[PDB]
Symmetry: C3
Subunit: 294 residues, 3 copies
Amino acid sequence: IAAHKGVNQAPVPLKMERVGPHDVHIEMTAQITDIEIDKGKIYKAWTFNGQAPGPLVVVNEGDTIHFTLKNMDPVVPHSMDFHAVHASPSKDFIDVMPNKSGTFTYPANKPGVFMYHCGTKPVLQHIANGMHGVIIVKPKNGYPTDKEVDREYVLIQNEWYKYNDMNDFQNGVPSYVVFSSKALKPGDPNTNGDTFTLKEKPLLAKVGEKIRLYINNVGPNEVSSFHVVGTVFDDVYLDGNPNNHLQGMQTVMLPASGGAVVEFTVTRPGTYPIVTHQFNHAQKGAVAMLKVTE
Amino acid sequence: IAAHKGVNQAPVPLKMERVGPHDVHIEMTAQITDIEIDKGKIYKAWTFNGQAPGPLVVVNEGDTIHFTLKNMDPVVPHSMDFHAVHASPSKDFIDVMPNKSGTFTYPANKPGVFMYHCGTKPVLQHIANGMHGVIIVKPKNGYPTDKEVDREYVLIQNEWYKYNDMNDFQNGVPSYVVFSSKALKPGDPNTNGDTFTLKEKPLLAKVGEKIRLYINNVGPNEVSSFHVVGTVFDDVYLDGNPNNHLQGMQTVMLPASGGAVVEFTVTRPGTYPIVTHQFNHAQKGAVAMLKVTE
Amino acid sequence: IAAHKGVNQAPVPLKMERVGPHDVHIEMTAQITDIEIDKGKIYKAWTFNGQAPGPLVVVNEGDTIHFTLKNMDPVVPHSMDFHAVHASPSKDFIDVMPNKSGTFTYPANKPGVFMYHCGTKPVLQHIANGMHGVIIVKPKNGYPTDKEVDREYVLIQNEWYKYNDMNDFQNGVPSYVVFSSKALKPGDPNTNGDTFTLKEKPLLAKVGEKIRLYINNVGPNEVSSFHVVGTVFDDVYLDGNPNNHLQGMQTVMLPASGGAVVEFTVTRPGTYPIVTHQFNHAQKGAVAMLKVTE
Ligand SMILES: [Cu+2]
Ligand SMILES: [Cu+2]
Ligand SMILES: [Cu+2]
Ligand SMILES: [Cu+2]
Ligand SMILES: [Cu+2]
Ligand SMILES: [Cu+2]
Ligand SMILES: [Cu+2]
Ligand SMILES: [Cu+2]
Ligand SMILES: [Cu+2]
Ligand SMILES: [Cu+2]
Ligand SMILES: [Cu+2]
Ligand SMILES: [Cu+2]
Ligand SMILES: [Cu+2]
């Protein structure tokens, strides 16, 4: 794309504010931003807000979202599909033209860990170039195990392919498969999907803690076999719905776009790798680290 | 196959009749039939009854099936394996020679949404060429959410490869991944697995309705990440067994041959895409449409 | 690897003994051993104890494992990661150098069917070359269906690639996908992952029996769609945890490293194939047989 040559739009902060007991405003951008996905490898990503995956959104069950997308891409239209919401896709997930904005309103009635992504045709191209992310909807009555949790983080898995190559997107193996972490509280790391950041700067915890991870595999194409080395998941809630409760799982399978809330205890000091156990993907980048100290 | 050159056997209707309170007769054919799997692309499919996937079969829990296969293929033997039944594979799923018939009897004791397919060696070749389908076994006591359902449809996902190419079947990516719909009531569409029919002629519903889909991924090779754009699944029954109940899932993972009953509400008028969220497969055809009107 | 040329170390028996009501000693080797993975095809595997997958380990819920690895490989370091245990990976899953031994201690608190494997970097290389296996942890209170089970076996699925070829391990399709069986009681077969042994020498059962299979898909890379032809799973316990109970499943999806306990009835005499229903993998070897006699 000639109009993207030389373009590197600086990241713009997510804007969110509550406007009523059950209403929240969210404003995002669509923008073109260089991201280092592996050491020495820059991908000129199509992004929300200059992050890939995009910024974390958190709302409460029952919130209506008033969402605005400002399209900063000079030539390509973009859109937004939140898996959390009930909406008419042909009226509410529609394209915003370059240099324009669009506003859409829809309710988030269901708790869980949902994917969001651009919905512009061809959707594979927009997702693969980086237009994906997670929205968490907090359950009204929490999770049954809330009282046991000592620390929590968000992890997202995605793939990267050859740059803007539709043949590779459709028919090729991923070049990289990566984790990123998105901040829930001040001080938490907030990273892009790359092969190295969560190895060099591990997530942190204390010996004996029960950790909760909110996880989602945004794809675009692969399923995930999510596993924390050195522990077993005490509790798993599929898609983050409190009713979908499994216990004692070694590994949690996630479809493309699938999410979960997983909880586990770290019993001894050391560094605990976090992987997809499809080890071709782990070898291509999908290993994060959790450093546990006394 | 020289004996298949020029062969295009017209579709034959499925024959079924109840012969007792718990006994049903089913008669199918194995036949060679040209199917348009993508615009301008004809596949000379190996089929049951001239449809790929084959015709829908529906029985009640506890029915014994008296099944006859008439093999119209001039050279290749064919057989039938129903996942619904308890049977001896080496006596009951055996080959029927060209121009012959065979009759087999076995019970369907378990409710759900089951794959059926030809069981002739090499099974990969017979499935990939089109010999797959779905049998639904209705639960004796229904599903707990029956009273909420306003409309229902059946969807099946399958792949297509290079024509009768065993190397591609074993080692290659699918050329197309497709949905088809099979009729439950008069007026419902009944389609083959192709990239376009359910886009051009969407399934129909009314605003506010709760929709039930009976779904199965027949493969042969891929898993599915089933998702309806613009909604969340209120209830999911894995393999269609009423006990395997999940709630509030954004996306339902299906193994190869796996089925489910999923239910969701459409809240606003518009067109709702239905996808596998493995977007390489969606790009290669696996998008259907649901048109919701006021 | 020049130091592996001509090396074929004879299999060494697993050593295990109980040393207290809740403590068990286990001693394994890491060794280089030629295995016939397909007719006429020898793979010089990296193994535990000269088997690939490695020997079966069975312990009770709540046992602490005192594990010793003796590394017989002349040049490559090796290690052990048990998915069953809570451990510090950076202190307890560490490398043992050639011709040395290491001892590690950790508890197995959770019931189920867990993968074990070498944890030496790059882990993909060590798993793909054969360093994988299963440990079963028996639940304190059993499974709710124990009284119904007449016979039980263990099955493991794995892949084989081009010999020690990291590009193929990361980017290629498997050359073979295979089942193996590991003995639970005297007289049970104990086999390696190959394309033929469980076809030529099927597992055995009697008409009318309820069979339990302990299953795990060790990968390294693929997910599994586990199915027994001619039956339906009466009960399924995901990861072998008694709480994760599904009923009436035709096919059980397993992530890479995922396990299950599955139970089904064989109603008629004959031979029942056992497959992954991803039929490209079945065609490449992943079909076992169960012979049922009167
Ligand atoms: Cu507003
Ligand atoms: Cu876009
Ligand atoms: Cu989506
Ligand atoms: Cu704690
Ligand atoms: Cu009859
Ligand atoms: Cu056939
Ligand atoms: Cu089958
Ligand atoms: Cu209604
Ligand atoms: Cu000891
Ligand atoms: Cu090793
Ligand atoms: Cu592991
Ligand atoms: Cu019995
Ligand atoms: Cu799955």
